């Protein structure tokens, strides 16, 4: 197996080079890691947290689980990262979500797609959980509708492609739950709403949570592999960082 | 070194593709045997990646068939210094491809069976390897 994972890794990086040159020539479809399974097998998701999570992070991890229909929350007590990724691959998991916090406030969210990546890391800002709502009620767990807005650049399409496959295929036309990822100066706003089609329009009710995610790393490999080749990184100390847009 | 046989296989692949290319593109029969052909060539590994019939016309080579020979695989896989040394180990019966022992140097590994080429359990030379690391287990007989 160690021989296979290496060989397939060597094969995996080969396509990403091959597709990159093909894309450049086209410049002059779905990504390969998802092309094999897109629209066939419903995504398998695991949501976990860092070691010794605080209560608020645990509540947030539950919220992220409710966001994605096929997400199951797993407690990370003492788990070793190679073991965690290895175990998830054995179970057939498709993507792994790990949440980090600072003083009971979520700060980061990293999404790694099995078996060979990619791994995307996000930073959470202005996080508002539904447990911060009184008499909020329970969620509806139908397959939601998805809204992606203002994703134009090639990196933008890549980011949409990562998030898009985390949900099920073929939501019912009349499904009332809509999830929207709105890009605004690289700050992707995430909202959850339930709508009712009226006789003269549509009225939406926000369910929550609210939080802004901004990609700052994207690596060709599982989150365990720290040596994985970086597809894209966020340059913060360049003089144009304060006004450079990437999505 | 003689490659008349391997040349016969490569030529036959080209002839089959040429005969296919003669058949109507819309014929369902043509399409499947093409895909079946590409599948088996992929299955053996001579096609490293899934390709098209046009690539199958030229990408197939004697070297690709020679590449899949069991002694050659070990050479890349670093079991033996040289192809001759690999042949001797295959000859002496120290090499095991999955559940079965292969004493024929002429055998080639399919793509799936590559990951399981490994030396027989009680080979004396394994005892040298684990002895060098000092990881020999007599309980495991190796």
């Amino acid at each position: 197996m160690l021989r296979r994972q290496a060989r397939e890794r060597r094969e995996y990086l080969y396509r990403k080079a091959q597709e990159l040159q093909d894309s450049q020539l086209q410049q002059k479809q779905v990504d390969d890691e998802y092309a094999a399974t897109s629209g066939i097998m419903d995504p398998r998701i695991i949501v976990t947290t860092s070691r010794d999570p605080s209560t608020r992070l645990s509540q947030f991890a539950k919220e992220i689980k409710l966001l994605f229909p096929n997400a199951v929350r797993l407690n990370r007590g003492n788990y070793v990262m190679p073991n965690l990724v290895d175990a998830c691959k054995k179970s057939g998991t498709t993507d792994l979500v790990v949440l980090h916090e600072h003083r009971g406030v979520p700060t980061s969210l990293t999404i790694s797609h099995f078996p060979h990546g990619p791994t995307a890391q996000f930073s959470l800002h202005n996080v508002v959980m539904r447990h911060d709502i009184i008499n909020a009620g329970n969620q509806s767990e139908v397959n939601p509708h998805l809204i992606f807005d203002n994703f134009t650049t090639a990196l933008g399409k890549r980011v949409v492609c990562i998030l898009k496959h985390l949900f099920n295929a073929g939501p019912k036309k009349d499904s009332e739950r809509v999830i929207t990822f709105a890009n605004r100066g690289d700050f992707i706003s995430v909202r959850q709403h339930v709508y009712v089609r009226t006789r003269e329009g549509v009225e939406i009710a926000e369910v929550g949570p609210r939080f802004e995610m901004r990609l700052f790393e994207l690596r060709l490999g599982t989150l365990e592999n720290k040596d994985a080749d970086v597809e894209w990184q966020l340059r913060r100390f360049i003089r144009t960082a304060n006004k450079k847009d990437y999505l | 070194e003689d490659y008349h046989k391997y040349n016969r296989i490569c030529g036959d692949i080209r002839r089959l593709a040429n005969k296919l290319s003669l058949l109507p593109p819309t014929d369902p029969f043509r399409r499947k045997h093409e895909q079946l052909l590409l599948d088996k060539l992929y299955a053996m590994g001579v096609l490293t990646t899934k390709s098209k019939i046009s690539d199958l016309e030229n990408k197939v080579t004697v070297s690709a068939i020679c590449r899949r020979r069991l002694p050659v695989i070990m050479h890349r896989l670093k079991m033996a210094e040289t192809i001759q040394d690999a042949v001797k180990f295959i000859e002496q019966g120290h090499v095991r491809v999955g559940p079965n022992l292969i004493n024929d140097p002429a055998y080639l590994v399919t793509r799936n069976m590559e990951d399981y080429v490994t030396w027989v359990d009680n080979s004396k030379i394994k005892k040298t390897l684990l002895r060098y690391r000092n990881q020999i287990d007599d309980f495991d007989f190796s």
Binding site: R10, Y14 | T48, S63, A64, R67, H75
Partner: peptide, 22 residues
């Protein structure tokens, strides 16, 4: 490599040389 490399290993070797150059 008496019989050469396939495409995938050939690509792997090229980066291997590039990294060692750095």
């Amino acid at each position: 490599n008496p019989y050469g490399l396939n495409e995938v290993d050939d690509f792997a070797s090229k980066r291997e040389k590039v990294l060692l150059g750095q």
